[PDB]
Amino acid sequence: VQLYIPLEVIREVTFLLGKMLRRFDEVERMVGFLNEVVEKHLSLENVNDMVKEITDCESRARQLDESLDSLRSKLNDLLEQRQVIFECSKFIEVYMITGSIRRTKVDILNRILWRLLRGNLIFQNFPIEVEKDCFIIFTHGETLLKKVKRVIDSLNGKIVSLNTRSSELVDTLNRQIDDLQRILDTTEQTLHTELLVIHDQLPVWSAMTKREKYVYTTLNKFQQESQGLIAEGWVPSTELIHLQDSLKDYIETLGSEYSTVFNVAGLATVVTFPFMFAIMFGDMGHGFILFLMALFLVLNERKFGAMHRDEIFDMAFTGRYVLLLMGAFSVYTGLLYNDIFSKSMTIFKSGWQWPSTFRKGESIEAKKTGVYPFGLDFAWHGTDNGLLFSNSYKMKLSILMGYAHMTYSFMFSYINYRAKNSKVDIIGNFIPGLVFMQSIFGYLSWAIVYKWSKDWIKDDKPAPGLLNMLINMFLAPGTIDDQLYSGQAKLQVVLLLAALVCVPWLLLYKPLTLRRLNKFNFGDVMIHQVIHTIEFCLNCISHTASYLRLWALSLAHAQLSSVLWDMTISNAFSSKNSGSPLAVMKVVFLFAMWFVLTVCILVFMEGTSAMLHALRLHWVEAMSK
Amino acid sequence: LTPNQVNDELNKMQAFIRKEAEEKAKEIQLKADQEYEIEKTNIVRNETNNID
Amino acid sequence: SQKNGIATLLQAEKEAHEIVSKARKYRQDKLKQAKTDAAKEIDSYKIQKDKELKEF
Numbered sequence: 001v002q003l004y005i006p007l008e009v010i011r012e013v014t015f016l017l018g019k020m021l022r023r024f025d026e027v028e029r030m031v032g033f034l035n036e037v038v039e040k041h042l043s044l045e046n047v048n049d050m051v052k053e054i055t056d057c058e059s060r061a062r063q064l065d066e067s068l069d070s071l072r073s074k075l076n077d078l079l080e081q082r083q084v085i086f087e088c089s090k091f092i093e094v095y096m097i098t099g100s101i102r103r104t105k106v107d108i109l110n111r112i113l114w115r116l117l118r119g120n121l122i123f124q125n126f127p128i129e130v131e132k133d134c135f136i137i138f139t140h141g142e143t144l145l146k147k148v149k150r151v152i153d154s155l156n157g158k159i160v161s162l163n164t165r166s167s168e169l170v171d172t173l174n175r176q177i178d179d180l181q182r183i184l185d186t187t188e189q190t191l192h193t194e195l196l197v198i199h200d201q202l203p204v205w206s207a208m209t210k211r212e213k214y215v216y217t218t219l220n221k222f223q224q225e226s227q228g229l230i231a232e233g234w235v236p237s238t239e240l241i242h243l244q245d246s247l248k249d250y251i252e253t254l255g256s257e258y259s260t261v262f263n264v265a266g267l268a269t270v271v272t273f274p275f276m277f278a279i280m281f282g283d284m285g286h287g288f289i290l291f292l293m294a295l296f297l298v299l300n301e302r303k304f305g306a307m308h309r310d311e312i313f314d315m316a317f318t319g320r321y322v323l324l325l326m327g328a329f330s331v332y333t334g335l336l337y338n339d340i341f342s343k344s345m346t347i348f349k350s351g352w353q354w355p356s357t358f359r360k361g362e363s364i365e366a367k368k369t370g371v372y373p374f375g376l377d378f379a380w381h382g383t384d385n386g387l388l389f390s391n392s393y394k395m396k397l398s399i400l401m402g403y404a405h406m407t408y409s410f411m412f413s414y415i416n417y418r419a420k421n422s423k424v425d426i427i428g429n430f431i432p433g434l435v436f437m438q439s440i441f442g443y444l445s446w447a448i449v450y451k452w453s454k455d456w457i458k459d460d461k462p463a464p465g466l467l468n469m470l471i472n473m474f475l476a477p478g479t480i481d482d483q484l485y486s487g488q489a490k491l492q493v494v495l496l497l498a499a500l501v502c503v504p505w506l507l508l509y510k511p512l513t514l515r516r517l518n519k520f521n522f523g524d525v526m527i528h529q530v531i532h533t534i535e536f537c538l539n540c541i542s543h544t545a546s547y548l549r550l551w552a553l554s555l556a557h558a559q560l561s562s563v564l565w566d567m568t569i570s571n572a573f574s575s576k577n578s579g580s581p582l583a584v585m586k587v588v589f590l591f592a593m594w595f596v597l598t599v600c601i602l603v604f605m606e607g608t609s610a611m612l613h614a615l616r617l618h619w620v621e622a623m624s625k
Numbered sequence: 626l627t628p629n630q631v632n633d634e635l636n637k638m639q640a641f642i643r644k645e646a647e648e649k650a651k652e653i654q655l656k657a658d659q660e661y662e663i664e665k666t667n668i669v670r671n672e673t674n675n676i677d
Numbered sequence: 678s679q680k681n682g683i684a685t686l687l688q689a690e691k692e693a694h695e696i697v698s699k700a701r702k703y704r705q706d707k708l709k710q711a712k713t714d715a716a717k718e719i720d721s722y723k724i725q726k727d728k729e730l731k732e733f
Contacts, residue, residue, distance in 0.1 A: 639689050665714060
């Protein structure tokens with residue numbers, strides 16, 4: 001859009017747009033000086049009279065600080081002169097030069113005076129307690145006495161000649177140390193009196209300048225053509241009517257009759273992201289721990305809101321409601337599985353009974369009595385082929401839930417093209433996408449359910465393989481080795497032709513009917529639709545195989561929680577030494593080793609990976625349809 | 626907002642614009658009356674002293 | 678009536694300028710008059726002096 005702001009209403013429109021320069025650089029420097037002194041120890045008139053009290057106080061604070069550090073230096077110049085008298089009357093009590101020097105130059109002054117006077121000196125040093133040092137020279141002779149002083153005064157040594165007494169200058173110097181220390185105690189008291197009205201006022205003086213400089217930096221970006229600024233810049237289309245309703249009401253409510261000219265997926269995430277998390281993170285024990293450490297942050301969200309959060313805990317507390325749902329769904333799905341710290345729950349009645357009379361150590365099967373009511377069955381726990389059944393179940397679970405997520409997020413594209421009122425986009429992208437996706441992987445997801453529906457043992461029919469059914473649906477059409485339903489060989493040809501007819505149709509409908517409605521770059525539409533067709537037909541295969549990470553990370557979580565239990569607390573269970581101190585400290589130490597490993601790996605450094613994988617399943621597999 | 630409301634805002638704005646311009650122009654011509662008299666007074670006094 | 682009103686306001690500020698200028702020209706003229714009417718004011722006082730010489 002393009003605004004036109006007159007000069008009468010210019011600051012008001014700029015401060016309105018802010019809510020919807022060397023001067024304030026200098027004043028920013030002065031507020032920085034006031035911020036350094038404390039650490040060291042609006043209308044135009046309402047800014048113009050507060051910049052006055054910034055400057056009028058910066059001046060007195062600078063002169064009072066510069067009359068304080070230069071007075072502290074004069075104090076130390078007398079405290080260094082008292083010590084070189086105290087440490088050189090002591091040397092006589094145990095042609096000589098006495099003075100002060102920095103400690104880093106004592107050795108180089110010793111070497112220069114030893115190279116000047118060839119020998120001929122007795123050089124001492126006594127540390128004054130920047131760090132400094134005293135020195136005594138004993139220049140034995142003459143004619144170099146004014147030349148030793150050109151060594152001392154060159155590298156900033158301050159000679160202290162006394163020539164009267166070591167007890168009469170000390171009184172006249174202590175009569176100045178305290179007399180100047182009282183001036184320190186006066187001016188520093190005045191300093192701390194001045195800083196009281198400033199330390200509680202700097203967040204106003206600073207925050208005025210930080211936004212006033214920000215106003216003028218933006219006002220430099222405008223045009224200034226014909227005694228009126230032209231503001232050209234970007235605004236989203238949702239906020240156009242908000243600008244045209246807020247700028248119109250504001251210029252009229254203040255008078256000044258010269259009007260301006262104004263020319264020109266996280267809502268399905270809220271359930272699916274914790275649920276796609278929970279499919280990978282399936283356990284009632286780890287899920288209850290994560291729900292509990294989330295509910296600790298939800299119930300304490302008032303004490304943690306008014307608190308400084310570092311980045312990791314700001315990440316953890318900003319999402320205190322993503323983790324509550326990620327625990328609440330993990331309890332549900334780990335009650336669907338029998339996985340409570342990788343153990344089973346014998347809640348309901350089993351659908352499998354074991355034989356009563358069997359030899360010890362032999363391999364036995366179970367006879368099917370019924371079906372387990374809610375969730376997976378608990379007679380698959382200590383089972384040799386239980387992992388094959390869990391592989392089949394979780395693979396087909398991942399296929400069906402990825403199919404459901406993709407065909408749910410693909411309808412939002414139709415709702416978008418319907419809200420845009422573009423039937424060309426509907427018939428060019430949604431329908432050839434719908435009857436391409438549903439004719440292949442909708443058929444796969446239907447075939448999984450239909451194989452689950454049939455018995456295949458009471459019927460005495462071979463159970464078909466569904467991998468080499470979809471392999472043979474594209475390679476050898478019409479040839480069905482294991483028949484899955486009546487009329488399969490002729491319906492799969494119809495579905496194959498319905499899928500293959502939408503590869504030219506999705507690629508050729510929209511550019512050839514945008515070209516027909518111009519009777520616009522045809523090269524920018526045809527190449528884009530070829531890329532869209534290749535990308536979509538690739539991704540329909542590439543995402544239904546990428547949703548199998550819901551089975552991958554679930555298998556990884558279940559097997560790691562099993563082989564951690566089996567290494568830690570399956571060793572602690574023994575019917576020998578019942579009640580012994582060693583046999584109970586064994587259980588204590590192995591429970592501690594189990595619990596810290598579960599919390600450190602299987603919650604924090606495993607559920608974070610499950611969280612990020614349910615995140616990329618939204619960012620790519622759902623937010624591309 | 627709507628055509629009645631933007632025009633109501635217009636009427637108010639030009640009312641202030643026009644009024645202010647009237648006051649500003651008034652003060653310049655009011656100082657003009659005055660400056661004519663003070664200057665005339667001085668010029669006339671100097672000459673009357675030469676004449677006298 | 679949005680872009681019909683903007684046109685009225687751009688005009689009004691121009692008019693505001695002009696109203697002010699009309700007064701600004703008037704002020705400059707009133708100063709020139711001060712010198713001229715002061716020059717006319719002196720050849721009426723020179724005859725008021727000559728009057729009282731002839732009377733004398």
